[PDB]
Amino acid sequence: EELSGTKVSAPYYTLEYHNAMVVGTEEAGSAGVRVLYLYPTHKSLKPCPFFLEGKCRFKENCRFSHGQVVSLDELRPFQDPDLSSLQAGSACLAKHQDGLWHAARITDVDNGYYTVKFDSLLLREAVVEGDGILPP
Ligand SMILES: [Zn+2]
C-alpha cells in the first residue's frame, strides 16, 4: 500500500469534512480508502493499536476505531488548521495527555504557546503548542 500514511480530508457522518489519514486501499461499491480520523474527541475515535498491526480480535465492535472506508471520489485535500483567529478567550479543542481533543478555552497566548482551561472539571489547566490546539 503506497497511499498508506497520506493525510487527507474525509466525509464524517450531518455531513462534515475532517482531517484523516489513509491506512490502505479497500472497495466501498467503488474503489476507496480506509481512513483514520486525525483528531479524536471521544475514546471510540482513537485509532486501534492492534488493528494497524493486524492483531485485533474485533471486526466491528472494538472499543477503538478501525477507521471508515470512503470512496476516492469523496476525498478532499488535507485542510491545514488555521490558528490565526485563536486569542485569549477563544474556544478551542486542545490535546490532553489521554490522547483526545477536549473542548477548552484559551487563557493566554505567548509566542506560539497557548494556556488552555479545559471545560471538563476533571482536567487541569495546560500549556499547548500549535500542534496541540485546533480552532472550533
Ligand atoms: Zn480494534
Side-chain angles (χ1 to χ4, degrees), residues 3-6 8-12 14-26 28-29 31-42 44-58 60-62 64-67 69-73 75-116 118-120 122-128 130-136:
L3 301 179
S4 175
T6 312
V8 294
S9 181
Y12 174 87
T14 192
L15 182 85
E16 272 211 313
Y17 272 70
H18 288 277
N19 287 340
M21 202 194 75
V22 172
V23 180
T25 190
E26 222 177 296
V33 282
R34 186 174 278 272
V35 300
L36 281 165
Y37 294 97
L38 278 200
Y39 319 125
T41 53
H42 185 278
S44 61
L45 289 165
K46 272 159 116 180
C48 179
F50 303 96
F51 174 71
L52 291 169
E53 292 288 291
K55 301 248 193 169
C56 194
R57 289 184 176 156
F58 302 87
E60 276 145 313
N61 288 129
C62 176
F64 304 121
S65 178
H66 282 208
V69 178
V70 298
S71 63
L72 295 186
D73 319 287
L75 295 170
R76 277 187 75 188
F78 171 79
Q79 284 154 240
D80 283 282
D82 186 23
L83 317 177
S84 294
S85 58
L86 296 184
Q87 69 182 309
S90 292
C92 71
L93 226 55
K95 198 188 170 288
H96 182 267
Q97 287 187 329
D98 70 342
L100 300 177
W101 297 74
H102 298 274
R105 193 151 238 105
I106 308 151
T107 60
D108 213 279
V109 186
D110 216 304
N111 307 311
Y113 293 85
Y114 307 78
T115 77
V116 294
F118 288 96
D119 298 351
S120 139
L122 309 173
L123 305 167
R124 294 198 166 85
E125 265 190 32
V127 184
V128 299
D131 65 344
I133 198 141
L134 284 174

